[PDB]
């Protein structure tokens, strides 16, 4: 069965092309309730398109006290990975989680998250967090299934790259 383990220098050249692309078919619409500052959302369909999530240099995460990469291995091949760092607020921060396109929805991502939680706890980190865009509904639903909640959002940060679009950053948190 599937194995999740820490990335090693010797894995760097055996690292295959992993398809991190996904289909954007909808977007989250955010709202702020007056009850417990709860950020809520509704889903709105948008004309579909494909995009790649992704600079990430794997070697920068090998042999480091506060950052690490875990890889998912199935039938002698790396089929997914998770990139983690310790953030300024003490939480573990997911820089990137990717499962090869052909193997998604089969529980690999949840197993990567479970390992990330172990790493966070081993380092005395009180939770895990990450940022995603409101047009990555697949990822949003995945984090929600994993126990994460929306703690914040930002309507202007993406304008610095492109002023035409209306991409929104969403910040997700899982507290232990």
Binding residues: 97, 99, 105, 107, 109-110, 136
- When the beta carbons of 101 and 159 are compared against a copy of itself, the nearer one is 159
Is residue 106 near ligand ACO by the rule CB under 6 A?
yes
Query: Which window, 33-41, 57-65, 106-114, 157-165, contacts ligand ACO (CB under 6 A)?
Result: 106-114
Count of residues touching a copy of itself (by CB under 8 A) = 29
Which listed residue (7, 84, 92, 109) binds ligand ACO by CB under 6 A? 109
Is residue 75 near a copy of itself by the rule CB under 8 A?
no
List all residues 6 or more positions away from 158 whose beta carbon is below 8 Å from its beta carbon: 133, 165, 167, 168, 169
Is residue 134 near K ion by the rule CB under 5 A?
no
Is residue 136 near K ion by the rule CB under 5 A?
yes
List all residues 6 or more positions away from 97 whose beta carbon is below 8 Å from its beta carbon: 80, 81, 82, 83, 109, 112, 113, 130
What character string, x for contact with K ion (CB under 5 A) and - otherwise, covers 110-129?
--------------------
> Which residues lie near a copy of itself (CB under 8 A)?
30-32, 37, 39, 87, 89-91, 126-127, 129, 149, 151-161, 163, 169, 171, 173, 175
């Amino acid at each position: 069965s599937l194995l999740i383990r820490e990335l090693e220098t010797n894995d760097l050249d055996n690292f295959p092309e992993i398809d991190d692309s996904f289909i954007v078919n909808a977007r989250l619409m955010l709202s702020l309730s007056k009850v417990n500052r709860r950020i809520e959302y509704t889903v709105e369909d948008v004309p579909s398109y494909e995009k790649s999530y992704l600079e990430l240099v794997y070697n920068e995460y090998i042999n480091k006290p506060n950052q690490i990469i875990y890889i998912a291995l199935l039938h002698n091949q790396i089929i997914g990975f998770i990139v983690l760092k310790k953030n300024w607020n003490n939480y573990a921060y997911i820089e990137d989680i990717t499962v090869d396109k052909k193997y998604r929805t089969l529980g690999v991502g949840k197993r990567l998250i479970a390992q990330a939680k172990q790493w966070a706890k081993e380092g005395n980190m009180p939770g895990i967090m990450l940022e995603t865009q409101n047009n990555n509904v697949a990822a949003c639903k995945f984090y929600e299934k994993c126990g994460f909640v929306i703690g914040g959002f930002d309507f202007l940060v993406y304008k610095g790259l492109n002023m035409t679009s209306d991409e929104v950053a969403i910040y997700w948190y899982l507290h232990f």
